[PDB]
Design a protein around this ligand. Sequence first.
Ligand SMILES: [Mg+2]
Ligand SMILES: [Zn+2]
Lengths: 1340, 50, 140, 502
Amino acid sequence: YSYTEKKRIRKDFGKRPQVLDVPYLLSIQLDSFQKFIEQDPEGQYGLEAAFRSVFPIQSYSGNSELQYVSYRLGEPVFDVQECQIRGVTYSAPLRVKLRLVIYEREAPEGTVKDIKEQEVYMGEIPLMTDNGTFVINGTERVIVSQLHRSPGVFFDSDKGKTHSSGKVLYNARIIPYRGSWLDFEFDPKDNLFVRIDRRRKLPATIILRALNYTTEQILDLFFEKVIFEIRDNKLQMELVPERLRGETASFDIEANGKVYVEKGRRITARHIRQLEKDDVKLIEVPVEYIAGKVVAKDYIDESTGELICAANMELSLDLLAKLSQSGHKRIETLFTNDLDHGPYISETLRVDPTNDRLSALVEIYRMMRPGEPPTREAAESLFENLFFSEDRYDLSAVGRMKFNRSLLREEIEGSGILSKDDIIDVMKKLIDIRNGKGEVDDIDHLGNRRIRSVGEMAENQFRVGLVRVERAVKERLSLGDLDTLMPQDMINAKPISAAVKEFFGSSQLSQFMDQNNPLSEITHKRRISALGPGGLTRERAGFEVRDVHPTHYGRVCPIETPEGPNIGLINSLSVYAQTNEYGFLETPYRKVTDGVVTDEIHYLSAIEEGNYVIAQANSNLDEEGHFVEDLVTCRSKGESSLFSRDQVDYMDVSTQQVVSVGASLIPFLEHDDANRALMGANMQRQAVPTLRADKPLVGTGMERAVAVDSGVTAVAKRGGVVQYVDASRIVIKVNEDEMYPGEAGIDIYNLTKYTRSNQNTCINQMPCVSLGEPVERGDVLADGPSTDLGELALGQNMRVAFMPWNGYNFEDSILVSERVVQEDRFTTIHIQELACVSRDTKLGPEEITADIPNVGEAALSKLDESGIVYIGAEVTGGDILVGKVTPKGETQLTPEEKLLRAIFGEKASDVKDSSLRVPNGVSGTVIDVQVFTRDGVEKDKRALEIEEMQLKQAKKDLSEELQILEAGLFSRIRAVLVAGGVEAEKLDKLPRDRWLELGLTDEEKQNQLEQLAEQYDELKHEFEKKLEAKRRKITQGDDLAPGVLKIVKVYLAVKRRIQPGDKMAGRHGNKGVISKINPIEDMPYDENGTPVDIVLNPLGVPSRMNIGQILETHLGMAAKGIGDKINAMLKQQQEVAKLREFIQRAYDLGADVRQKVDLSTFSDEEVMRLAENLRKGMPIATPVFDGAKEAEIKELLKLGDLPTSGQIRLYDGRTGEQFERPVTVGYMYMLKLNHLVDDKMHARSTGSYSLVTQQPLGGKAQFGGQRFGEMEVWALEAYGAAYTLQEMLTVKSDDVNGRTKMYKNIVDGNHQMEPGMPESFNVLLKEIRSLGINIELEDE
Amino acid sequence: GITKASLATESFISAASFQETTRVLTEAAVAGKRDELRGLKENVIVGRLI
Amino acid sequence: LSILAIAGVEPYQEKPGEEYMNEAQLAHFRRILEAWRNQLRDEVDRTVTHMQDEAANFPDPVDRAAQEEEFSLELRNRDRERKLIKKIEKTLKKVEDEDFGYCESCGVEIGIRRLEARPTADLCIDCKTLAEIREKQMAG
Amino acid sequence: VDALLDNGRRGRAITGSNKRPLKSLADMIKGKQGRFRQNLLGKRVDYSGRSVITVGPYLRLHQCGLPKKMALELFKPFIYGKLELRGLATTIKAAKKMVEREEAVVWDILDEVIREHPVLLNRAPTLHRLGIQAFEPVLIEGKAIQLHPLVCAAYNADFDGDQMAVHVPLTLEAQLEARALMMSTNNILSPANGEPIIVPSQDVVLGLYYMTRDCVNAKGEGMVLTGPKEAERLYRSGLASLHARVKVRITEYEKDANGELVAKTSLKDTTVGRAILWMIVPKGLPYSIVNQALGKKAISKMLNTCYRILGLKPTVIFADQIMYTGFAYAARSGASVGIDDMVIPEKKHEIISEAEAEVAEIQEQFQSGLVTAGERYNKVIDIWAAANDRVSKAMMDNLQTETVINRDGQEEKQVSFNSIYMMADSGARGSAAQIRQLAGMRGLMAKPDGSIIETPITANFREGLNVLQYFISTHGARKGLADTALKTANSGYLTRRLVDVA
Ligand SMILES: [Mg+2]
Ligand SMILES: [Zn+2]
């Protein structure tokens, strides 16, 4: 048992043992990017891969070739923190080595010279954080992994709804990784067609003609031959004994001197058995059956040299006579069977307007590029570039794999572009399914959906970056002089860095990290989307792809998906899921060999899994690990049934592996309706972090995994003991085993302190260890926000009781006791960033001076002499944060203003008042001021005080490092010097700096002291440079936008408590809007007097079948019972014996669990610290499907000395009388979501108006009025509200003149309206009148 | 049918609200059509009493 | 099958050379078919009666999606039961007439023990399965 | 020229340096759909705001709880007016500074301008004219809007965090318009079907039901009291049980004359609850209307008859009293819900083993190709489909009546007083449909196909579900949400077409 587990241990119900612990949840993000940016000395996906494809680039046959050597990644210009404050993207410079070779003219190749240009720079490429995010402009962003149709070929339907005939249709689609789509589709007439992209449909055979296949070769390929001999006179026929199945006799069919079947009897198993056993090879026939048959090849007249019949032409009873007299013994025909092998391609040829190769190559060119004439060079080049150019086409490896797979080939890798064979084999297979042999795919199956993620998608954006620079490089290499241009003159920087900046900056897949919550971050980074580039569109598909598919089991979560306009279009990654080498979705399983269940695990992709028969999660195995029952519920090929003991090939890994990280955090989930469960794990991520990190009384076990794997916490790199603990930093003196040989020293973890998050919430780390405590590798060193002691605590549990409280929980509304707001426990800390910009306008420069026209000293009190607000000043609405003035000269004031200025002697300023002031209603504490100044504009007074303080602070921090690092390093020197010369007292009198001289007798210890010497002088020198760059970065001109001189960013820390309007919900999809805040005096209490914190409405539970919220409340009730029990015994100071005796009883409970526990833990110093941590309640774990059962919950109620009902009688705090009936009370973990009221509440009387349409518009954040759309007008029309409507869309909005006539009237106290015409309509009149239309207003 | 019935409206302004606007004006502008208001939609458009 | 248990009938004791149509056997199978038809008719009536109480009592907006979901399943189901009754009735005409017991596609005879299992069987095991295969192929 | 007028009836001339095509004059009128300005939305509107909505049962039906902060900014020109009318401000510029200073003097002024001045409340999809209603505003410390609970039914508002908008009727006309047409009390009947739309919703109906209900034997059985006035006195002091069979003297009225009130006094056989309740019902109604059990259905028919006999005014104030009281007794009752409320039949596992062998029967016939394959699917699907109707009407007999209790003599059983039952029978929340998924097993689900799956959910919510059972429950849930997502779009288009032709 570990170190931060010994502190507080979650009682775990649930029987199935955990065999594989949840892996790093951020695997995907970190893994994928690492592959992209990394040296791979071969083609495997990466930056290397993209290069080797396009390179070598070669000039226009000029034998001037530019080849690709290798590439490097420069060090980050700013690190994570630095880059964030300033607003740069966190990027590294890409330096790539290029070699320019020139071939003599004319050359059996080899070079006159080659200049080996060192690393040209092509932009900076962003870098990923330690936790899988990017920084794009000082703002953390996430790149959502994508789901798109796997490359390969897929045969599809379009059954039913097509044409209102039924019939169905069948289509094939060849979807390559890069290059044009190739679609093959039928139609009602059973004609085969092809279309490139979604373009014009064309008769399928046209491409065969383009591959130099004529009519004869087209027939030979897709059809068999029926050979007709003219032997003696009039017609014999070669018979295949199988061909006659599914048809009826056409005449008297006889052979071998015996009539097997007569006219009119369908040829069945009887007739074919006779022919096959009697060996009937050749039969004589009548001349009329060939009246319909189609001739295969070309047959010409040997005498006249004329064409008798062209290939694919139907014969007649007279045409045969014409080629019989010409001496033709053979006539080859097509095998046509409308049950087995249908005459499809034949009819297409009769619909094909082309005949030769250039005919089709033109018809292809004119389809792609209509309007312009076809050419020989045009048609040939276009088609060769479509599916046969290494440059313009690639299936990738995945494409080649699924392609060959679906066609039942052997090779798993081959060509990267399509061949004449590939296309034919595909055309063949499409026909086969229509014939009844073979089945179609479905898009939804996770073997035909592939997952790409940042590493791959960036590759494509670099690839597109190169293809548009390649044209440019080829162009310069055309005219280029001798030894003057070098491989840098041609390659520009902006084109490469822009094509990648485009992506991370604005993209459907690049978004602001959902960071209000350690769960929110981790649930975002594990997210899928079928939208955007290469995927489906919301307006396209279409319920089949949105709906949950059988293949999601153990790969994609079935329940965590958004609840909006794109349901099922997102999904979230399952716990144990991982991405296949080829990019499919695989899941872990357990190898069941014969009748024993092993623990050796196998990863099975979506295609791999179907074949096997997989057992179930909940399966009882005992002793060696045989299945206990002779029959076990299992699922095999897409379905589920009972199976024999030794038929199961694998078994589920965990009871959990089907859900997501979000879904797994709900306790007693099994008992919750699927609808409400979705809402539960949907709202869990919206949990704003609380003031005091609680801990869930009712847990599942996953909470520790989510806390650690999300970055918010500080996890010990190396095990050791704590030397120094600060709210700022934590220093760990490493143990000897893990400590590296040289440099010795200590690991020092600097904590993140109060700072703005993406959602204006606060992200603050706190130390969770004490001075000199033992920690092991991978221990929790400091809690993030809404995490405690290593567990994920998204909220605070409280005493909750289900009962009507005079209607103050009418719908799902929540009723909260004052005890909560007094305890400041749902109080929530927010950090807003407000910025002031000194710009440059045409009239002049803006000054940040504190000289502000027409303001009293009352303002400039909270402002320093320079004009910036002091740190620490608690301000409210209206207070000025940064005084600012803009040049606005010669106001041109009116008569009465001049006299007023003259009466009171105000110096009507030549500068406008533009200062940044605090938005009305929001109020908080200033906790930080930043100043960013143009390079070359003078730093004002306060700006220099700041940049002076940052300097003094940075030196103290860095020097603290060296001071701690020296003593840490010197402490090892002291101990190795003791090994062969130990003079304990003699050594430490003299100056420690005067130690380096002391040597050692012949031994490796002399070579070890040599090691510590090296790493000493580097700390000495590495200090200097770290101080230099740090110092330059502060003073260096901070770069801003054009037109902007200097910027002041103030960071506010507003502390918002909790009030009616805030949305809150438990984890079970029970929303509710807090309605009244009651006195503890008025709360329902029990005979012990203890009030209850929240009074929820019982009606919300039966309707919405979220029954887990009840189980949670009861288990929570029992969990607090153990707490109150220990709290009494802990206050009694009973002694270790009585305490340990009671706790031990709790952790077993009934029998059969997985928990295990003491007495190993040191029966004193360790045991005592634990008891404290439990008195608030005993943390229990209900795994997802391995959860606790009613008996175990009720059993823990007995141990807590609490009623088994989970209900008690209560007394109304107002009347003091009893409540009839027992009511349920218990503890339910509850979240406060950030739909906080004082963010939603807006109001506007008269504000700014939009320029184009004089219409209320949010401009100064006094937001626009409510929009009064079409439907709200029908409302007034249904009433008689004729005037209410007029005023609504006249004076209240659009009537530029009416609004002021009204406002003036309002204060004069005359409620009237002088309406006139809405400007919205006046512009239509002008807009109409500026077209050719004479639109007037008639009459009077 | 309801959808077709609405397509015929005496007031051309009402039609350019929910029908295809380009077609309505052209068809109406060549005809020299006079709109007398009378209906609801249009009086709301032009902002006088329903 | 609990079908034989509900009634006081015991598995039929087919004798060695036992025929197929005597007074006692058709009187025996007529009763079973009539009793079977009468039970389904009572089931269809009970279904319709339950559905109307839901149609008469109005649920609250929140439980409407759950009531609507459950109302649709019964309706679909109800229509399925009505088809089955027509199928048994069709089978009752085959007993009375003289064209019961053989595959409709090929003249092959359908098994005796097989017909006691599914008296509504129209095809032999060979022909029926191929039809399901074409089905999955002609449809999807 | 052509790209200027309507670009798109050519090749689509693109804008400078920007790939996107440039928007022409015709495209400045056209849109999605038609004229943007008249299309939702729809023009933004001065004097307005919004926030999250909450409850407030203390309201009279003609009022609503409006945040102090909002009302100040909203009526700003009105306050500026009344302030200098009474002489509290030298000039408007001072008035601006006064309300900016939030001087306490202004609150007393605001209360003047607020009194007889209605505001308009509007909630998300405005579906019928009852989607906007006019209330009289009451000042609130807090940032949420307080919404009288009875209108929550009409709005299809729940409290899952929904927000509503406010609108100030400015002109004198708009005030008199909002008061005589859009006011709460003027619209209590739905214009679609004459029945009350201000029907008691859920919490409030659960109240009266528990109240006007009787159990076999409890304190107060059979005694007699002078009238309802002294019937209440008996309960509040713990001498009588709310539900005990009791004769009391009542006086009902009946206007059976020519619009004239006739009085009748009688010794009715009732319970204490129904006794207490009659003190609300105004004059001319018969005591018969409150003598029954009062479920959601009967509770609204009662309100209705009050309208069609006494008129608007008495019904309004009546309806208020119902709400105040319904909420109150629900609280006294201490009604709740725990795990032990969802009583599973003792016979459940029995029912299973029968249908489990029946499926084992239809399997036996399938085995090595006896009977065809597709038959077996639909054979089994039938033997499952029956058992759910068996389990349902099994638990429903146990859940319904099994409170077995005795009156002085031997034994007796009556409608259960179990918590979860009372809710559905009354109509407060949940339906026999939903109960069937809490206690009995929850039906069969169907795969994405629509083709119902041959192994139903054999577990219920009081039990756990296992891996597969939840995974099967998934499809119906997602398609369920998906569907109702579309049922929003379909309604919207249907109603839109209908008003265009009307
Ligand atoms: Mg809502
Ligand atoms: Zn057959």
